[PDB]
Amino acid sequence: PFTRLVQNDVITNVLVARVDPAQRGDAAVDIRATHATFAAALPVDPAAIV
Amino acid sequence: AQRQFFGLTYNFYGQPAPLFDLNDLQELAGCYARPWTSRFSHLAISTGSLPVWSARYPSVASRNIIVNTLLGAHLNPFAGGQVTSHQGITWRDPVLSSLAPVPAIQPPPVWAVAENVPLDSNNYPTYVLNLSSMWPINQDVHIMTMWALSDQGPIYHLEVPVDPMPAATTAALMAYIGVPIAHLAQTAYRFAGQLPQSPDSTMVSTIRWLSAIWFGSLTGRLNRSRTCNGFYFEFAKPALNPDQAVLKWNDGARAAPPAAAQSSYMRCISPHWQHQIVEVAGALMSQSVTAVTGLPALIDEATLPAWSQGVANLTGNGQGVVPCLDYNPVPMAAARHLQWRQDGLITAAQEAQLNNDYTAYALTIERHLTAMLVANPIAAGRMPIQPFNAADFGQAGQTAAAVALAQAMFV
Amino acid sequence: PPGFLNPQLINPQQAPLLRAFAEHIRANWPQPSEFGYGSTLQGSANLFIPPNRMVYPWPNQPLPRLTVAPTYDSAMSNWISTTIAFFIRVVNSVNMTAT
Amino acid sequence: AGPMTSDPHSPVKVFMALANLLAQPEPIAIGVPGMHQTTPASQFSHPGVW
Amino acid sequence: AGPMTSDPHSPVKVFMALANLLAQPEPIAIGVPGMHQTTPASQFSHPGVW
Amino acid sequence: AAVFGIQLVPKLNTSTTRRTFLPLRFDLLLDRLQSTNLHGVLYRALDFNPVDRSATVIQTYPPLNAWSPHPAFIENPLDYRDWTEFIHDRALAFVGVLTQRYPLTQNAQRYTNPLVLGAAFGDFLNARSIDIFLDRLFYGPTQESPITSITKFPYQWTIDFNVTADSVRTPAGCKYITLYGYDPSRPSTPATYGKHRPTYATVFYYSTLPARSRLLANLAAGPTVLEHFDSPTYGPHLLLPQTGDVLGYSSSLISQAALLMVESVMDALRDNANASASTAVTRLDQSYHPVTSFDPSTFNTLLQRATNLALLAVQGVQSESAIPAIPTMSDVRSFVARLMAEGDPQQWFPYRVDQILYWPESPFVPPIGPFYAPFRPVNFPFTTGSYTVVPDASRPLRLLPQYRNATITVQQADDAYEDTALSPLITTHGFCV
Amino acid sequence: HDRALAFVGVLTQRYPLTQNAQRYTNPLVLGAAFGDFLNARSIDIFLDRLFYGPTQESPITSITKFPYQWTIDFNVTADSVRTPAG
């Protein structure tokens, strides 16, 4: 979802997990500690956009 | 789409607990997979190819029956608004995606056992809020309810409009000509199962017509001589295996539309349905339509088991009530054969022969089932086949009324 | 910055432009919208979004009927005009005039 | 050079010609659908589109 | 790699190591006369300087 | 009888009969537009300063409140004196168009479609052609609804007016207009809940329930959708608020949807506070109701809390203190602040997605639709009855003790005192002699 | 009048009144925090330590619990506090 100026709703991470954390006993852990993270960014140029 | 449904859990036949084994659950709904469209994964074109003749699940209907009983232990959110656990197993998530053993840290409350529990969608708001993903539950719950409401055969609904078929249905049916009924039933189940649809959709009307045509041919009113817009079903020889039918299209004279719109509810009154694929497929196909469009009207309580009397949103005895008819296959077969002779398709000598063959065929089914019941007494804790008494095979039911309806349905 | 979360913290007599800029941004930043795609008959591969739906950073409309033409009430056009108007106000501010 | 021509549609064409240049600051209504204030003025050649 | 070693002072050394890096953002009072949050962590090698 | 920071009296009160809708006759429409003065007829100034000749906030009325100004108007507002001149010009011109077609003597009896009229008028003063609408200005109320009369032409009429076989989509009109010199920061200015912005929301009228289902499926991914169940003005319709927020109303505790809820709740409270048996009203339940993207399980955001109160307000509850007829920014701020205070949420009536529960003992009377159903809370403390409000006092009050049979030991008395008393205190002597 | 009201809103966004009316404000912290506020400088560091229990310590000793440079104009040691005079 596209959030807009809502500080508490800013999406910091998109996550994916290959294994069931319940088996590892990670049921109560921070989600970031249990799921992989995507990290990709593209540096566009304002001048072309304008 | 359709934002609401109502349901009813199964009845315990005097037994204290829902009748299914942990192995049945682990077998029929395990693997952490989604159980919401599996009703056809264990069906095929004919009994000859299926392991319905021995061991566990020794009947055509056995697996689906067990499925219905299984759900009755886990549909609490639509009854009390809360997910619960039963014998250490519960849903993985509020979306009810799949089942799993309970966690050790914060178990959900244990379900208090009960039977014939009425169900409302509104009791569980998250369902509507996630309707797009939780849609398949609607179909299965409806199917379970349609079976739970009746002893012997499940209940399904029929209707025929005063208008001719639209072209879309005509084109669609012209592509399903040579298909056996079992494959057709799968598509109908597959269609309504996996994503929300509006009742004003071509497939919905298409399947609606199919159920009508199937019944009309089942009663023998629709034949090579007389057809609905050219379509009709053909049944296999009783001398080999009558439990099979396929679609056909023909030059025959087209039946005229009824004077007024006709509709009713149906069920098989005799235990033969439990081991007869055409009945199971026909019911499931017809029930699929009601799943997407909801119940047109309350079902008449007059001829239903005790627990079905006056179920809210399902059964009634008032003015806005549609009667439900029932039949026995053997008298039905005799009527179908008689209609064939009157239409001139066969001679009197053949009609007598056909009755002898079908009766002999049905006898084996009865003989197989009755022996199977004592092999699986319901006191064992699981119900692979619905209980019955020996006299249940002899009931004529409302068969005479049934053929009369087809008489009025395809004039 | 706290002022960016609540422009009222910025005293007008201390930082006139910045307070105006914050208000301009909070008021004219476009509104995300939504539309559908694909066919429900075929299903969809959406994970978080409901199936056969797509989100869209700007407001959106159905396809027009007759010929198109430039317009001036779209969200982007409004964003452009207000932005230009603000900077013009900046250029005429006392800070520029002195130099 | 408007009145010198014999085209009956000369006046409306002259009017629309300026209207194109002022579409941004000064908007007006155009009767028939499918035509806008930025439509090339030379196309207004029908009595029903005045 | 803390618990793998046999040095009894290893836990304290591990703790101080982070404390050194956080001297500016999270200053605290180390109640040991003669030591500071910026003392090299590896030198905390005795009881009583815990 | 308290919800978070809101205080409620134990008596229930609400009106008992609904006024039926009637469409506007063609002649009557011309009369309103031809009124020699349109203030108080087509619009009203909530802010007029008689010392000057100026106001800053205007409230609009049905023929006009459907308008959505083009942005060039918004970014450069005019003053009151220009406004009154501008309207009187446009009103007369619009009358001329309406009468150039449809001569009065042959059309006075016909009923105008309010939806078409609103859209047509709104485009007109937006300097946009309106010919497409004039063909369908009238409808026969005995034969169809203002909605179904339109769905005879299921296509995109214009870029801001799109109608399908079952539904119509159009931007919601601006109920308030801010003139030159508007300033939300001034606490005494009248509240507008952001409705002055041209595109604060969008409405979807629908003719039948399956259409309603179809619309919701499309909107499920966006912001929260709101709806009235009781009496949806011209017809059943959803509305989709703008996904942003509005400045000045709180410490940024707000999104647009919450604002619509909270002001709707206030209106519901105000009506309950002054409803009477002898007076019919257009609607018993003024509250909105969320139908998408909502959490019934949590109460840590304004939208959740407002909904939780609204479910109770429909029963006919009243606030312990009166709320202004024309609230200012300060008034709204006080209301929101109380609503966000720490406290328990009421749980007499559970939220349900698209059905509302009512107490049979409540004075409320359900409409014919399926959206309402009776319900029995186990320990509901309220009773039916009216309650009047007393003006404030200029003097500190004095009371005379009167006791129950209960009594308390000294130690409990002391410790209860020592943590509630202003133990060190500043006083004045006054004069003895 | 503008700054006073704004300062109140900050003080009430944290520390809701009904749970904190009885608490005593540290005058030193209050003065420093307010002074920075209308100097358009952030004050978050101060808000954590606005109150103190007068029966248990002094407004000074309540601060010396955090002996480090709080901000460029408010420096506190283990025994003393330095700040410009108002």
Strands F161-163 and F156-158: antiparallel
- What are the tokens at E39? 């003392």
Evaluate whether F77 touches F182 at the Cβ level (below 8 Å): yes
**CA distances for F134 relative to B58, F26, F35, F113, F119, angstroms:** 72, 13, 22, 11, 11
Residues 6+ apart with CB under 8 A from D29: F127, F128, F129, F130
Asked if A8 has any chain F CB less than 8 Å from its own CB, the reply is: no
d(CA G24, CA G52): 6
Least Cα distance to F59 among F76, F85, F83 occurs for F83
Helix-, strand-, coil-residue percentages of chain A, each rounded to 5? 30, 10, 65
Q: Walk across the sheet containing F161-163 and list its strands.
A: F156-158, F161-163, F167-171, F201-206, F237-241, F226-227, F289-290
| DSSP 8-state class, residue G24 | P
**CA distances for B377 relative to B11, B13, B373, B382, F39, angstroms:** 16, 12, 6, 8, 85
Longest dimension (CA), chain D: 32
d(CA A35, CA A14): 9
| DSSP 8-state class, residue C36 | E
Evaluate whether F399 touches F21 at the Cβ level (below 8 Å): no
Three-state DSSP class for C63? coil
CA dihedral E38, E41, E46, E50 (to 10 degrees): 60
Longest dimension (CA), chain G: 37
Asked if D28 has any chain F CB less than 8 Å from its own CB, the reply is: yes
Test F127 with D28 for CB contact under 8 angstroms. Answer: yes
First to last CA, chain G: 20
Please give, rounded to a whole number of angstroms, the shortest distance from the CA of C76 to a CA of chain A: 12
Place of tokens 């014998």: B87
In angstroms and rounded to an integer, the radius of gyration of the C-alpha atoms of chain B is 21
Evaluate whether B218 touches B336 at the Cβ level (below 8 Å): yes
For residue F107, how many C-alpha atoms fall within 13 Å in the half-sphere facing its CB? Answer: 16
For chain F, which residues lie within 8 Å of any Cβ of chain C, measuring from their own Cβ? Answer: 70-72, 75, 155-156, 159, 162, 185, 199, 218-222, 242-245, 247-248, 251-252
- Residues of chain B contacting residue C45, judged by C-beta atoms under 8 Å apart: none
| DSSP 8-state class, residue G25 | B
Strands F156-158 and F138-139: unpaired
Three-state DSSP class for E33? coil
Test C65 with F242 for CB contact under 8 angstroms. Answer: no
- Residues of chain C contacting residue B132, judged by C-beta atoms under 8 Å apart: 50-51
d(CA B253, CA B228): 8
**CA distances for C24 relative to C83, F176, F302, G40, angstroms:** 8, 21, 25, 21
d(CA F107, CA F98): 11
Residue F410 burial by CB count (10 A; 0-12/13-18/19+): exposed, middle or buried?
Answer: exposed
Beta bridge partners of B232: B248
Residues 6+ apart with CB under 8 A from B340: B220, B223, B346, B351
In angstroms and rounded to an integer, the radius of gyration of the C-alpha atoms of chain D is 11
Give the sign of the dihedral formed by CA G71, CA G72, CA G74, CA G79.
positive
Evaluate whether B402 touches B326 at the Cβ level (below 8 Å): yes
Place of tokens 């439900």: B324
Residue of A nearest to C50 (CA): A1
Three-state DSSP class for B377? coil
Please give, rounded to a whole number of angstroms, the shortest distance from the CA of B130 to a CA of chain C: 8
Three-state DSSP class for B283? helix
d(CA F266, CA B319): 44
d(CA B130, CA B166): 34
**Residue B177 amino acid letter:** I
Residue of A nearest to B100 (CA): A22
Residues 6+ apart with CB under 8 A from B386: B61, B65, B151, B152, B271, B274
- Phi–psi pair at F24, nearest 5 degrees: -85, 130
Cβ atoms within 10 Å, residue B313: 16
Q: Which long-range contacts (CB under 8 A, 24 or more apart) does D8-13 make?
A: D8/D47, D9/D44, D9/D45, D9/D46, D9/D47, D12/D44, D12/D50, D13/D41, D13/D42, D13/D44, D13/D45
Asked if D48 has any chain F CB less than 8 Å from its own CB, the reply is: no
d(CA D23, CA D19): 6
Report angle CA B140, B141, B143 to the nearest 5 degrees.
60
- What are the tokens at B185? 């039933």
Beta bridge partners of F226: F239, F290
Residues 6+ apart with CB under 8 A from F203: F169, F170, F171, F172, F237, F238, F239, F240
- Phi–psi pair at F345, nearest 5 degrees: -85, 145
Residues 6+ apart with CB under 8 A from B240: none
Least Cα distance to B61 among B188, B191, B151, B132 occurs for B151
Three-state DSSP class for G70? strand
- Residues of chain C contacting residue G38, judged by C-beta atoms under 8 Å apart: 11
d(CA F15, CA F6): 22
Residue of C nearest to B192 (CA): C41
Evaluate whether F261 touches F310 at the Cβ level (below 8 Å): yes
Cβ within 8 Å of F, B 69-98:
81
Least Cα distance to B331 among B272, B247, B407 occurs for B272
- Residues of chain C contacting residue G6, judged by C-beta atoms under 8 Å apart: 8-9, 11
**CA distances for B112 relative to B26, B76, B104, B124, E40, angstroms:** 22, 9, 20, 18, 63
Please give, rounded to a whole number of angstroms, the shortest distance from the CA of C70 to a CA of chain D: 8
- Phi–psi pair at F25, nearest 5 degrees: -70, 155
Encode B147-158: b = buried (16+ Cβ within 10 Å), e = exposed: bbbbbbbbbbbb
Evaluate whether G63 touches G76 at the Cβ level (below 8 Å): yes
Evaluate whether F335 touches F323 at the Cβ level (below 8 Å): yes
Three-state DSSP class for B155? strand
Test C66 with D38 for CB contact under 8 angstroms. Answer: no
Evaluate whether B69 touches B18 at the Cβ level (below 8 Å): yes
Asked if G68 has any chain E CB less than 8 Å from its own CB, the reply is: yes
**Residue B275 amino acid letter:** H
Asked if F355 has any chain B CB less than 8 Å from its own CB, the reply is: yes
d(CA B153, CA B286): 13
- Residues of chain A contacting residue F245, judged by C-beta atoms under 8 Å apart: 5-6
Test D34 with C66 for CB contact under 8 angstroms. Answer: yes
Residue F382 burial by CB count (10 A; 0-12/13-18/19+): exposed, middle or buried?
Answer: buried
Residues 6+ apart with CB under 8 A from B27: none
d(CA B269, CA B399): 9
Chain E contact partners (≥3 CB pairs within 8 A): G
Encode F171-207: b = buried (16+ Cβ within 10 Å), e = exposed: bbbbbbbbbeebebeeeebbbbbbbbbbbbbbbbbbb
For chain C, which residues lie within 8 Å of any Cβ of chain F, measuring from their own Cβ? Answer: 5-8, 23, 26-27, 29, 31-34, 36, 49-50, 53, 55, 59, 61-62, 64-65, 72-73, 77-78, 81-82, 85
- What are the tokens at B53? 């003749």
- The full length of chain E comes to 50
Three-state secondary structure of chain F: CEECCEEECCEECCCCCECCCCCCEHHHHHHHHCCCCCECCCEEECCCECCCCECCEEEECHHHHCCCCCHHHHCCCCCHHHHHHHHHHHHHHHHHHHHHCCCHHHCCCCEECHHHHHHHHHHHHCCCCCHHHHCCCEECCCCCCCCCCCCCCCCEEECCEEECCCEEEEECCCCEEECCCCCCCCCCCECCCCCCCCCCEEEEEECCHHHHHHHHHHHCCCCCCEECCCCCCCCCEEEEECCCCCCCCCCCCCCHHHHHHHHHHHHHHHHHHHCCCCCCECCCCCCCEECCCCCCCCCCCHHHHHHHHHHHHCCCCCECCCCCCCCEHHHHHHHHHHHCCCCCCCCCCCCCCCCEEECCCCCCCCCCCCCEEECCCCCCCCEECCCCCCCCCCCCCCCCCCCCCCCCCHHHHHHHHHCCCCCCCCCCCCCCC
CA dihedral A11, A17, A22, A27 (to 10 degrees): -20
Report angle CA C7, C21, A8 to the nearest 5 degrees.
50
Question: For this experimental structure, what is the resolution in angstroms?
Answer: 3.3
Place of tokens 């009167």: F402
Residue of F nearest to G21 (CA): F420
Least Cα distance to F69 among F125, F121, F128 occurs for F125
d(CA A29, CA G86): 49
Place of tokens 């009477």: F276
Asked if F341 has any chain G CB less than 8 Å from its own CB, the reply is: yes
Cβ atoms within 10 Å, residue E20: 14
In angstroms and rounded to an integer, the radius of gyration of the C-alpha atoms of chain G is 13
Give the sign of the dihedral formed by CA B259, CA B265, CA B271, CA B272.
positive
**CA distances for B275 relative to B57, B84, B359, B364, angstroms:** 11, 34, 15, 11
